[PDB]
Amino acid sequence: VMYYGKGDVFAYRTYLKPLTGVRTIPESPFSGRDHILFGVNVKISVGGTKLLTSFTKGDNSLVVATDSMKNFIQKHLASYTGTTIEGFLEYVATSFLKKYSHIEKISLIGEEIPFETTFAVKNGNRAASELVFKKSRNEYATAYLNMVRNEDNTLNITEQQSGLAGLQLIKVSGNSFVGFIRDEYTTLPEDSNRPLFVYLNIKWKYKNTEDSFGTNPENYVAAEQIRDIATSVFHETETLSIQHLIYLIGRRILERFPQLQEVYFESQNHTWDKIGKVYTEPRPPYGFQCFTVTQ
Amino acid sequence: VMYYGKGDVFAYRTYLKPLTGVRTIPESPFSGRDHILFGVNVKISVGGTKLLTSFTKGDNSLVVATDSMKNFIQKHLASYTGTTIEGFLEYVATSFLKKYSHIEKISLIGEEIPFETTFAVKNGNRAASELVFKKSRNEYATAYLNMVRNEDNTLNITEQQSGLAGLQLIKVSGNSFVGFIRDEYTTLPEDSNRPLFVYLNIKWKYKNTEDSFGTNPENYVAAEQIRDIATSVFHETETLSIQHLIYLIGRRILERFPQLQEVYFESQNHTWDKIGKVYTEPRPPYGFQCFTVTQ
Amino acid sequence: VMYYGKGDVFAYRTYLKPLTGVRTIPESPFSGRDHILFGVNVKISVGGTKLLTSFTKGDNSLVVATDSMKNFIQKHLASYTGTTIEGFLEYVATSFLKKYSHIEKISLIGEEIPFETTFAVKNGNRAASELVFKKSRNEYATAYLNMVRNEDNTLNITEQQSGLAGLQLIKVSGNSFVGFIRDEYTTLPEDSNRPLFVYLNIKWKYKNTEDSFGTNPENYVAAEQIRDIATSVFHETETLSIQHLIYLIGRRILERFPQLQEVYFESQNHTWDKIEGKVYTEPRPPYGFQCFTVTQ
Amino acid sequence: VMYYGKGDVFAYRTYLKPLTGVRTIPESPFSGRDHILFGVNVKISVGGTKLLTSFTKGDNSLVVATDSMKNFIQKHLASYTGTTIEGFLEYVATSFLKKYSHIEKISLIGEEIPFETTFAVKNGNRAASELVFKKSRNEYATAYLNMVRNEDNTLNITEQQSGLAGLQLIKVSGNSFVGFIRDEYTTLPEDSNRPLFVYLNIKWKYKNTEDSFGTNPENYVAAEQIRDIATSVFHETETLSIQHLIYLIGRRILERFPQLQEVYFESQNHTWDKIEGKVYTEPRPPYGFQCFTVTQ
Ligand SMILES: O=c1[nH]c(=O)c2nn[nH]c2[nH]1
Ligand SMILES: O=c1[nH]c(=O)c2nn[nH]c2[nH]1
Ligand SMILES: O=c1[nH]c(=O)c2nn[nH]c2[nH]1
Ligand SMILES: O=c1[nH]c(=O)c2nn[nH]c2[nH]1
């Protein structure tokens, strides 16, 4: 392995071009993003055989400083004329490879720093403020992009993946976990009605990576919409396990968004122990599941 | 000092009696709490001169196990018939002192564990779920109560305070910080238009402690309402400092709730450095302010 | 209440004057501090009635910017010629009140950012490096100071406290917790031999505030020494409770340091749950705690 | 992708068989591990085509409960008779695949929960306690293992890797970063003498997986020894970059441990910003990093 880069490149832009014209779906009110405030945390990794002597000889001649990579990202956010994190990563990646001919590969992560609307009163009327926003430490959209320079000097996206991270959902009833293996190691009781508490990371890949950019917004899949599909499916499903739940969420996603090729899940079980009905936090060990649904 | 207790007593109650009958204010849609899911994180501390030999001699005869205090709290959440964290603390405090004659003082903290509603579709109709909720790591309500046993064996609440913790607000424009002292230690440039980013912890005390319990809901002050006052005042104010903002928030709160005696603020400055406009995270050191507005 | 200030003022100084000439105790090999690297995390709070209109009117005329307080602290660590965090706080506090005559009260916290020695081979042998240090996220020393300006413009310290925070100690045997109240709220089994795991914050106050500064280092009480008393007493004692343990630690501290007026404990119980060999695991989140003062 | 499992399976064992008979190196005094307290945090992931209907149909007939996996791990730590985390993972993995014939693959991560010695006075002298230990939140050893079941029901290790995580080292002088690209994105000054502060995660792979277990301890590579190589090479080296340093650390590791095939680094730059004495402070959050393998 040989690469290097910069992490935790926070960048906040005001008044990015708004994202409008999205295709709505039944599960979600989402219809675009005002982009009064657009926050992203970027990580950049780069590689190329020509970097070898920066390691083996201490030769910094071909080292773009990681501090300069941070400047590069923040300055490109000031000039970005598009409307999504996905498109912003493509802009940064193409621009970086065009600038630095000795770089052969670039990997980018962008994580949304989300902000929510707040109430303000003007002339007695309460409505969403256009100035004051609330920083959210809950779920957030993500985007990943890998681009390479080929032998013929063409640039090519070899991987692209969008996502929703940090979704923590609890359903108070209508969940069971029964029928699992009972042997010398099994102490868990069957439960026909548990308050299933899952953490979800959900990632999707497009059949056509250009759909991820938002330039034709009707083909863009929004993390907000994915969130609302997950809650809808959770609500309507008498779940039989987390495994069963996440399969059904994935099927619904792929039904609503035929332009997607796959949906990938990382889920964690954080269900409370049962002590009106009162529950409490469990000991630290947590179950998890990882599963891809394909179109 | 001599006391002991139990922290991080998480307890989750389903279907607590709903909080209804509250007074609604223009700044906030708040009109009560459904209480399908009621989460609280409780800290209990107890004292009394008869505890002395548990320390000085290793005598456990008068030690209620801290583990038992956890059981006490969780069982009392199961039997609580009221509608507020503040009232639940009074229930626990009175019950504990009635149970254990050798305890002279009990302090309680209750911190809301907040859950937000989610969307679900049924037969082409999208609505709030009554089953699926989203765990929030953003702002949360708080309550504090200290109760003592007097020499005539009556019980007396000696301090009560409610609050809202963890509110993080950024206003993109309409904020200035100018006119401060410039001397050998001053490098901060004056700024007539900064995207002020404040963390707020807001606490209030009632003129009459009974109003905190929710027995008469018309007199209850909800943390949700405090939040929306704070965002509305931030929106409308051309801020001149954080100090200036929190004073005005406090005045508005006391105007809206004449049953309150005081509002106390703990604020922090997390405003980004300026690099379309793009900003980035500052170095770790953070400004802060602490101020009481009284009625 | 009315005050404001700056938190998380990190400041790393190289080659501070070393702390030597300390007085030893049986429980500790501590003999001083090299101070090749001296890290401290400072919080400053200031007050004064003349700050009122910065809140009530948005008048910044008498506001020292909190950013300037950061500069103030960092610049004073560069000029500090003493040997302790405690003395550094007195230097900052006196300097700040002299500089800003409208400020009536200043409160300072300083938390050590500790670094540990590492090994290097050079010139034929392995020895402690004078250049490479390891950042520790374990226990750390603390200091607290409050100073006021009186009507006549003199300055006075009104509270001083030193401490050791974040000490996490587990003793695998030789601890019991029996004989506690067993009633309708009790499900805890009695345990005659538990692996007691305590978190300890330990804070001490001097009879004479001057002794906290290090100027006469023989009167200084080092957090390293307090750590070593705590581990020794934990080892020595067949404990009967955390309560029992911390009283005994406190008594040993005040016996070893007669210049101390008192020692205050915040302890927490993190003892593991028991499942050929003995195995334990992490408990549920709820944690017991004790707060207790032993006085001279 | 299809797998499921259990994370944060903390397990603490007392009086595991000690690790001794190790082979020493010049950079390190490491001579073994007492194992009075042996703490590990385990993550287990399992897979197999026969699990499909647990997702597609909600059929749990072939689901080992993740809670049962936690019991499996903890009980196996009680019966483990070996001396390393690496060997513990092999014991768990082999045992789990033998128990559950429908599971085709298991991956395990084991992270050390490290404890440090403390001082106690008893019977006239101060010495290391055999009972009281200090929980450390600094660097820690790691182990990774993947095992598969073949068509003929034999089991094979398919990947093994050991490591040291969380090592945070600052060298106060004797580091430069100069000569890098200065173009329209460059605002970093050249620096001929910086206090380079790196975080290091170092992972190694053996030529022969058996050498990772400790059964013949002379062939085991201890994380403690890797730590001490890293601190020695950092001290010895007038560093020209983090990239330069980690290559030199990796070369030394491979020279000292010919039984290793390769060593892999993840480093992060956390060097302080410079504000009488020299004073530095914490930087803004963005951090540089490097990922690099040195092979034998
Ligand atoms: O949904 C669940 N899936 C599982 O695999 C499992 N194991 N224990 N509990 C569980 N719940
Ligand atoms: O609102 C502010 N108040 C202050 O006191 C301050 N100091 N620096 N920046 C500041 N901003
Ligand atoms: O040492 C202890 N003190 C206590 O008060 C207590 N309560 N539960 N366990 C305990 N252990
Ligand atoms: O050691 C370093 N390597 C780098 O690549 C770099 N970039 N900025 N500073 C740096 N330091």
Is some CB atom of chain C closer than 8 A to the CB atom of A278?
no
Q: Where are the domains of chain C?
A: 1-296
Contact B228 A118 (CB under 8 A): yes
Contact A181 D70 (CB under 8 A): no
**Residues paired with residue B188 on neighbouring β-strands, in sequence order:** none
Q: Which positions ≥6 away from B152 have C-beta within 8 Å?
A: none
- Say yes or no: CB of residue B242 within 6 Å of ligand 2: yes
From the list A49, A50, A53, A66, the catalytic residue is A66
Residue of chain B minimizing CA distance to C76: B185
Q: DSSP string of C65-97?
A: -HHHHHHHHHHHHHH--SS-HHHHHHHHHHHHH
Contact B243 C290 (CB under 8 A): no
- D242-245 own/partner pairs: CB under 8 Å, 24+ apart: D242/D196, D242/D198, D242/D267, D242/D269, D242/D288, D242/D290, D243/A4, D243/A54, D243/A55, D243/A58, D243/A63, D243/D290, D243/D292, D244/A54, D244/A55, D244/A57, D244/A58, D245/D196, D245/D198
How wide is the angle at C-alpha A105 spanned by C-alphas A99 and A109, nearest 5°?
Answer: 95
Ligand 4 pocket residues where CB is under 6 Å = A 4, 63, 65-67; D 177, 188, 241-243, 269, 288
Contact C286 B8 (CB under 8 A): yes
3-state SS class at D164: strand
Say how many residues make up chain B: 295
**CA B266 to chain centroid:** 12
Is some CB atom of chain A closer than 8 A to the CB atom of C285?
yes
**Residues paired with residue A162 on neighbouring β-strands, in sequence order:** A143, A204
- What letter represents residue C273's amino acid? D
Q: In testing the pocket of ligand 2, which one of B175, B183, B241, B249 has its CB within 8 Å of the most ligand atoms?
A: B241
Contact D282 B281 (CB under 8 A): no
CATH class, domain C1-296, is: alpha beta
Q: CA of A246, closest CA in chain B: separation in Å? A: 15
- Say yes or no: CB of residue C106 within 6 Å of ligand 3: no
Is B81 a catalytic site residue? no
Q: In testing the pocket of ligand 1, which one of D4, D54, D66 has its CB within 8 Å of the most ligand atoms?
A: D66
Is some CB atom of chain A closer than 8 A to the CB atom of B43?
no
Cβ contacts from B onto D, under 8 A: 14
Nearest residue, CB atoms, A236 vs list B122, B135, B172: B122
From C291, D31, D191, D236, select the one nearest B43 (Cα to Cα).
C291
CA terminus-to-terminus distance, chain A: 33
Contact D119 C27 (CB under 8 A): yes
Strand ranges (E), A136-185 = 140-149, 155-171
- Say yes or no: CB of residue B253 within 6 Å of ligand 2: no
**Sequence ranges of the binding site of D for urate:** 66-67, 177, 194, 242-243, 269
Ligand 1 pocket residues where CB is under 6 Å = A 177, 188, 241-243, 269, 287; D 4, 63, 65-67
* Whole-number Å distance between alpha carbons of D227 and D163: 10
Task: List, as ranges, residues 75-134 from D with C-beta within 8 Å of A.
Answer: 75, 99
Q: What subunits touch chain C, counting only 3 or more CB pairs under 8 A?
A: A, B, D
Is some CB atom of chain D closer than 8 A to the CB atom of C67?
no
- What letter represents residue D62's amino acid? L
* Whole-number Å distance between alpha carbons of A152 and A159: 19
Residue of chain D minimizing CA distance to C238: D131
What's phi and psi for A75, nearest 5 deg?
-70, -35
Task: List the determination method.
Answer: X-ray
Contact A281 C285 (CB under 8 A): yes
R_g of chain A computed on alpha carbons:
22
- Say yes or no: CB of residue B265 within 6 Å of ligand 2: no
Is B43 a catalytic site residue? no
* Whole-number Å distance between alpha carbons of A284 and A269: 11
* Whole-number Å distance between alpha carbons of D112 and D140: 6
- The token pair that represents C264 in the structure block: 């205050």
In angstroms, the Cα distances linking D25 to C119, D22, D74 are 13, 10, 34
In angstroms, the Cα distances linking A31 to A34, B75, D89 are 10, 46, 50
* Whole-number Å distance between alpha carbons of D143 and D36: 20
Task: List, as ranges, residues 199-218 from A with C-beta within 8 Å of B.
Answer: none
Cβ proximity of B75 and B141 under 8 Å = no
> Please, where are the H alpha helices in C138-283?
223-236, 242-256
* Whole-number Å distance between alpha carbons of B205 and B211: 10
3-state SS class at A252: helix
From D115, D142, D126, select the one nearest D36 (Cα to Cα).
D115
Is some CB atom of chain C closer than 8 A to the CB atom of D68?
no
Is B66 a catalytic site residue? yes
> Please, where are the H alpha helices in chain D?
52-56, 66-79, 85-99, 223-236, 242-256
From C234, C222, C292, select the one nearest C260 (Cα to Cα).
C222
- Say yes or no: CB of residue C188 within 6 Å of ligand 3: yes
Q: How many Cα atoms sit within 13 Å of B45 on the Cβ side?
A: 16
Location of structure tokens 């964290």: B85
* Whole-number Å distance between alpha carbons of D84 and D214: 6
Q: In testing the pocket of ligand 2, which one of B171, B176, B177 has its CB within 8 Å of the most ligand atoms?
A: B177
How wide is the angle at C-alpha C68 spanned by C-alphas C64 and C71, nearest 5°?
Answer: 150
From B86, B100, B58, select the one nearest B160 (Cα to Cα).
B86
Q: Which CATH architecture has domain A1-295?
A: Roll (3.10)
